[PDB]
Design a binder for this molecule. Structure first.
Ligand SMILES: [Cl-]
Ligand SMILES: [Cl-]
Ligand SMILES: [Cl-]
Ligand SMILES: [Cl-]
Ligand SMILES: [Cl-]
Ligand SMILES: [Cl-]
Ligand code: NA
Length: 150
C-alpha cells in the first residue's frame, strides 16, 4: 500500500523504454524516482531549431492526481517560460489529468515551443512582441537559441 506515485512512475519509465519519443528524452536521477531530468530538442521549423534544452522534473507525493513540477534549466526566449525556467502551461496546473504522462507533458512542451501562448503569459514583454511583431520575436528566439542552447 501507499505506493501510488512510485508504481505509476515505474510504469511510465518502463513504457518510455519500450517506445520512447524522438524529440525529447527523460529519466530518473539515480535512485530518486521522484526526480527526473529531461531534454527537449528545439522543434525543427521553430526559431528554437538546433537547440537542446534541459529540464528538471519533480513528481508530487500524490502523482498522478497532481501534476509534476517541471522547469527549464536552459535559457530560452518564450512568452510562457521565464528566465528562472518556470513554465506556464495549463496542463501543469488547472488542466492536469491523471491520464497525462511525463512523456505527454514533454511533448506538450515541445508543442508550446512550436506555438507559444501569449494569452497565458509568464513574460508579458515577450508575449506582446510575439503577438504583434513576430519577425522580432523569431529573431530574438533564434539569437537566444544560438547563445544558450547549442
Ligand atoms: Cl501500493
Ligand atoms: Cl520493458
Ligand atoms: Cl502531493
Ligand atoms: Cl511564426
Ligand atoms: Cl554567446
Ligand atoms: Cl553570456
Ligand atoms: Na500561438
Amino acid at each position: 500500500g501507499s505506493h501510488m506515485a512510485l508504481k505509476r512512475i515505474q510504469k511510465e519509465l518502463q513504457d518510455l523504454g519500450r517506445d520512447p519519443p524522438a524529440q525529447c528524452s527523460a529519466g530518473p536521477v539515480g535512485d530518486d524516482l521522484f526526480h527526473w531530468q529531461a531534454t527537449i530538442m528545439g522543434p525543427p521549423e521553430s526559431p528554437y531549431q538546433g537547440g537542446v534544452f534541459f529540464l528538471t522534473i519533480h513528481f508530487p507525493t500524490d502523482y498522478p492526481f497532481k501534476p509534476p513540477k517541471v522547469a527549464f534549466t536552459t535559457r530560452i526566449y518564450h512568452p510562457n517560460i521565464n528566465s528562472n525556467g518556470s513554465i506556464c502551461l495549463d496542463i501543469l496546473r488547472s488542466q492536469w489529468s491523471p491520464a497525462l504522462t511525463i512523456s505527454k507533458v514533454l511533448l506538450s512542451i515541445c508543442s508550446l515551443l512550436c506555438d507559444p501562448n501569449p494569452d497565458d503569459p509568464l513574460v508579458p514583454e515577450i508575449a506582446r512582441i510575439y503577438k504583434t511583431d513576430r519577425e522580432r520575436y523569431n529573431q530574438l528566439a533564434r539569437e537566444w537559441t544560438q547563445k544558450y542552447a547549442m
